[PDB]
User: Fold Fluoroacetate dehalogenase from Rhodopseudomonas palustris.
Amino acid sequence: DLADLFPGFGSEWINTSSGRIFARVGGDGPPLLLLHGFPQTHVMWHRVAPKLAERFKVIVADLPGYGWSDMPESDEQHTPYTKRAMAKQLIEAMEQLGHVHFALAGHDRGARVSYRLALDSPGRLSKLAVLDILPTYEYWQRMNRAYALKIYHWSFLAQPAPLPENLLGGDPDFYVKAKLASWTRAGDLSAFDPRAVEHYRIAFADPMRRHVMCEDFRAGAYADFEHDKIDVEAGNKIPVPMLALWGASGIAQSAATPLDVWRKWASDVQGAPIESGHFLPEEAPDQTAEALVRFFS
Amino acid sequence: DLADLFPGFGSEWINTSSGRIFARVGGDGPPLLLLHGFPQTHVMWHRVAPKLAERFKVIVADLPGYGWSDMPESDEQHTPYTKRAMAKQLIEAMEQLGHVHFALAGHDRGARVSYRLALDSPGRLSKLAVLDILPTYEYWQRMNRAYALKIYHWSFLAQPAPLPENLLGGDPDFYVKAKLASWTRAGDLSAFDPRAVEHYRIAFADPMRRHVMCEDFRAGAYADFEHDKIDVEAGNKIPVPMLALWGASGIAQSAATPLDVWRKWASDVQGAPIESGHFLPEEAPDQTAEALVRFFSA
Ligand SMILES: [Cl-]
Assistant:
């Protein structure tokens, strides 16, 4: 019943010391890892992965605990769902395929895995792309009234268990659909392929998958923020060549641009806005694919 | 069953242009209005009201849209559940009883109605007490990562409808009981009379009542904040003699010395902490009743 949205891609379960990572794998050439975010799975890359697979070996992975990847047991510090630990686990998965130096693009939570990977283990990356995010530390520094209202789920889903888990169990379909529609330019579900929405809905229907998501946001409020704070306080910048794409209707337009922000975090970064809400690869697949192909080539 | 927690008190169902206000009414002497907050009803005063009624004519009212008061249909600006509108409605209700100048004590949302009343219509009040709050402008101005995590429900319940309503509807008993317990000193329900909890649970079980509560917090995020912002930025202070009481373990303190905050908003204010979580009149009834009797009698 779940549609195969990756023509010409294999399906691989990749072992790691924290559990299996599921990926769709297609193409040939230099390796490129794609990492989704919340509340999605690897299938959010389905409109851009084919164009990338024209030039690259493309690995489209479910994040630890998301989609069909295994769910490592968490702990009081949410360790397996911190971006530092997720990056270590995906480094292990890439080693199983023999990739120790690869290109990486991430969106939303997956982009947070990606820039933490670049900060911790820059030798792993040839090039890095992040889609419609700023660093977790920056979004918390920005958490005034306006941001607390727009980005409320960062604090709501980080409340101690079982508060968000209990609330999410009454009507999971409504919540996942709201968290897809809300930051799109259209404000509805029309930018998404209905078969992709069903993948997201089925995943969100499982209480164990929702608990993982809450652990991700708990990590995002605590350890991820502290890890980012150490890099800011040390003046550490990503040295990996980097691309920051963002939605003109995504990150609230403001003071600096997102490129101005990323230049404080990275010594070789280019960027561009895309006519899009938050979900660049689905709302604006042609522009997003074109920008990634040009950057990664 | 709902218990009568003010045995001996009468009842009024008071017409206003915005809908009926339910109140319990007891005692004799100078008039004193008591206003509850979220997620409670007028019954939260049941451990202090009999003591106050020895000295005052005590009016224990359900806020507009709460308890047994009527629920006006809201609008895009949440107008009926703004503290400005609630204060106007309760002024009308008090006029129906012949009270045009009265003493007022509020807790939580009711305290926000109360200080807004003092800002808009100070001549209505002899004296004002506010329990475990800072002004809404101050909660938002303080907003940062630690506060966003500590008091998440201001931003959650202010999300556009129907998202909070949807989430609250699956298991409403769990949410209202978790909130009551979370904000007490001990973190459980031991501070509450179980008959009072049942009043709160029964009100919270009505989806229309839950929608009012969300409209109240939407007002809190939008128009109430804007009304407060106009007053601070203008330097307007409440002139009514004022008492600020807060729980040592309540919401208001957090990271803010409450009396110093209130001195920016009021020109004649005194205050004190009480060893309590948020729910001062139930967690510390003897000290709360004494503090209020002494303040309003002076
Ligand atoms: Cl409040």
